[PDB]
């Protein structure tokens, strides 16, 4: 029963329940002293029983007693049980000191074991350590002197902070923590700013993207906690998925796009057919504008194989490749075949590269290789200049004719239905079938048109080459997008469902390049709302299931 501002008092419902119990008990004693009819004593005993049960468990015996706010009083059982009870809100989960929270940005210059931490946030988190070091090195006579010294933000305070966090790991967490990779230990690097900088390669482990996400930070204090963070929780140690054993730090998006663009093959490029001494000469030719990244050349490659028994065999030989493949081989660690790089590199190929490096070389080599891979991917994705535009969404000329044919034969089958040959359900089913077939054929035609081009080689003959379309490259590399997304961008959206499950007879015949009118957008919203609501409920269902499983 404590006071608030302005003289108001805040109390607990247990006070009211106890007061009721005491009042009824005292009235029972008074009624037993002043001899009363048995009906009054019986009523008083009923009230005493009701009050005691309400104090122990309100609402179990009958109507729950409510306070002056017209809400039920919450009792001891309610204070020990429930989601907001003592077990789950204060015992299995707690608020902790030496913790912080901030928005997360992307640090492309960081290593796998490093995280960018704001200077002010670290100054607040590591305050006792700064006090201790100021006392130890003699810059402060007492602890209040250290307090004012830190508050005034002197330069030697910043040097002390630098030396404090020199090798002090810090724990980064993002909610929800679905698996143990949702909390990881990193080495902090102080940055001037207000946002935490996160290494891209760990984002997939955190399910984190930079649209406004926030992360929490915790500071281990004792030596045991620091060594647990350094040995078990360090991001370099956890690069395999505990669920399946596959790597979790595989590159995505711009890294994959850059590695794909650098490893593609082009017909009749500058510097085609040249002979190169090695990856260094390939890089020199690229920097001097002698040869393009996609020029087909012959390169002398020295390649070392580490067998299962540990034999190290080195072979140098002439390999037909591209300039970009050699410049990428420049960073591949020794012990891997060149065949892993002598191809266009999508997400699957880079995942295979990382898996092979882990399986045949170890952990440190894998970490260094991943860091170099992501550096190179970012650099050459920036150098590529890949851009999305309205002319990259090519719509096949066959779509209009195919829609016309489908509409005409829909008219024919409707006229046939008016003749009574078939029933309504059969007509519905076959109209659905023809529209599905038309959608599939339009998607196939759009994919064929988008996936290839005609070029002129050195001999002058027209040749068939894989397309360098931006959206096609994005989808084929696996960075982002699939066949369905391209189908809705440049082909046909297809058949959508009425929100009870039924499929509307007429489909959407317009993609997002040409645009939709009112009803097409309305049908789209019908399914969009259902998708959003389904995700919202399924998240909670999965959380409850994982709680039960844990």
């Amino acid at each position: 029963l404590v006071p608030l501002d302005g003289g108001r008092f805040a109390t607990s419902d247990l006070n009211d329940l106890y007061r009721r119990v005491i009042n009824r008990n005292n009235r029972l004693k008074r009624l037993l002293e002043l001899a009363a009819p048995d009906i009054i004593v019986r009523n008083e005993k009923r009230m005493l029983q009701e009050s005691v049960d309400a104090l122990l468990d309100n609402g179990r015996r009958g109507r729950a007693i409510t306070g002056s706010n017209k809400r039920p009083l919450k009792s001891l059982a309610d204070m020990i049980k429930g989601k907001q009870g003592r077990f789950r809100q204060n015992l299995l989960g707690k608020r902790v000191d030496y913790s912080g929270r901030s928005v997360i940005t992307v640090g492309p210059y960081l290593r796998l074991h490093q995280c960018g931490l704001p200077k002010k946030m670290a100054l607040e988190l590591f305050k006792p350590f700064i006090y201790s070091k100021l006392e130890t090195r003699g810059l402060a006579t007492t602890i209040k002197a250290a307090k004012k010294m830190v508050e005034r933000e002197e330069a030697v305070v910043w040097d002390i902070l630098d030396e404090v966090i020199r090798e002090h790991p810090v724990l980064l967490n993002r909610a929800p923590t679905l698996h143990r990779l949702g909390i990881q230990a990193f080495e902090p690097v102080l940055i001037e700013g207000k946002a935490i900088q996160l290494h891209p390669l760990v984002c997939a482990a955190y399910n984190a993207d930079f649209d406004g996400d926030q992360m929490a930070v915790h500071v281990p204090l004792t030596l045991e906690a620091q060594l647990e963070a350094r040995t078990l929780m360090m991001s370099t140690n956890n690069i395999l998925s505990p669920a399946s054993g596959d790597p979790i730090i595989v590159p995505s998006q711009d890294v994959v796009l850059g590695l794909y663009y650098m490893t593609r093959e082009k017909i009749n490029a500058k510097g085609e057919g040249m002979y190169l001494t090695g990856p260094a000469e390939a890089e020199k030719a690229y920097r001097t504008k002698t040869a393009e990244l996609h020029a087909r050349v012959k390169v002398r490659i020295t390649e070392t194989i580490k067998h299962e028994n540990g034999k190290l065999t080195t072979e140098t030989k002439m390999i037909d490749t591209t300039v970009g493949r050699a410049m990428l081989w420049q960073i591949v660690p020794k012990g891997l075949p060149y065949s892993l790089v002598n191809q266009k590199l999508g997400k699957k190929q880079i995942s295979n590269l990382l898996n092979e490096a882990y399986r045949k070389l170890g952990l440190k080599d894998t970490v260094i290789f991943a860091d170099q891979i992501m550096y190179t991917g970012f650099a050459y994705a920036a150098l590529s200049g890949v851009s999305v535009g309205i002319d990259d969404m090519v719509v096949p000329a066959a779509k209009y004719t195919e829609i016309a044919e489908a509409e005409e034969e829909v008219r024919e089958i409707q006229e046939q239905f008016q003749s009574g040959l078939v029933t309504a359900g059969e007509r519905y089913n076959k109209v659905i079938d023809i529209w599905a077939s038309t959608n599939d054929r339009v998607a196939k035609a759009m994919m064929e048109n988008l996936s290839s081009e005609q070029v002129i080689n050195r001999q002058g003959e027209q040749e068939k080459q894989e397309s360098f379309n931006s959206i096609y490259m994005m989808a084929d590399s696996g960075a982002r997008g699939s066949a369905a997304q391209i189908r809705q961008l440049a082909g046909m959206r297809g058949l959508m469902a009425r929100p009870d499950g039924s499929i509307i007879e007429t489909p959407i015949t317009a993609n997002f390049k040409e645009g939709l009118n009112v009803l097409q957008y309305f049908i789209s919203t019908h399914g969009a709302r259902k998708g959003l609501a389904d995700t919202a409920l399924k998240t909670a269902n999965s959380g409850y299931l994982t709680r039960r499983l844990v």
């Binding site: 009523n43 009923r46 009230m47 009701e50 015996r61 009958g62 109507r63």
Partner: peptide
């Protein structure tokens, strides 16, 4: 038939 003490009292 009832759980409210008031009704039993009446």
């Amino acid at each position: 038939r009832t759980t409210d003490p008031v009704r039993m009292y009446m």
